[PDB]
Amino acid sequence: APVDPECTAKVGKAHVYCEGNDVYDVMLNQTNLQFNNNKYYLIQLLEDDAQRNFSVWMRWGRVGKMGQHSLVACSGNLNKAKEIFQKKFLDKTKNNWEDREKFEKVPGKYDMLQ
DNA sequence: CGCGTACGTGCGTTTAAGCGGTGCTAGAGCTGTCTACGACCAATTGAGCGGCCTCGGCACCGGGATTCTCCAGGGCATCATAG
Prior knowledge:
Elements: E1 15-16, E2 18-19, E3 22-23, E4 25-32, E5 37-47, E6 54-62, E7 68-74, H1 78-93, E8 111-112
The chain binds one DNA strand of 83 nucleotides through residues 36-41, 60-62, 65, 67-68.
PDB class: gene regulation
Keywords: DNA repair, parp1, parp2, HPF1, ADP-ribosylation, chromatin, histone modifications, gene regulation
Entry title: Bridging of double-strand DNA break activates PARP2/HPF1 to modify chromatin
């Protein structure tokens, strides 16, 4: 579960935040040959060293290609960052982040990399 | 083969052409003279002609540059699809 080197705007200067089970770094994949879907989605929380100053990285596209990405900055509070992260994970998977352990692949939603 | 417009057809309106006359006069046409211009003619001579050279512009030949034609693609943007 390494920080993406492809995030040039953020590589080098920060360390991804995790907590045991709850790892706020993850890559999800969805393949579906019926509809020719083959897409991935990485999410990464990064902390500043000086202050409690966090950033949420999202990156998604067809497998292999960087496609598109978004940076939502959360210098305000890390809890906001958890909100964005967990809410988006639910939106995208229909699984809660606290209950991420018992993942059940519903059709047309992301699964993660074991 | 399709499409669109402009000319033919037909019909009604206007106006000067045609017609017929009258009248006027410019100039066409005729006639008579006479002169100057061209025919004519003979002699003269030089301008022009045939002949004869002759040199430089042109024909030819070759060779290379440029242009014209031509085709193959360098490369690169439209489009479908992703996420």
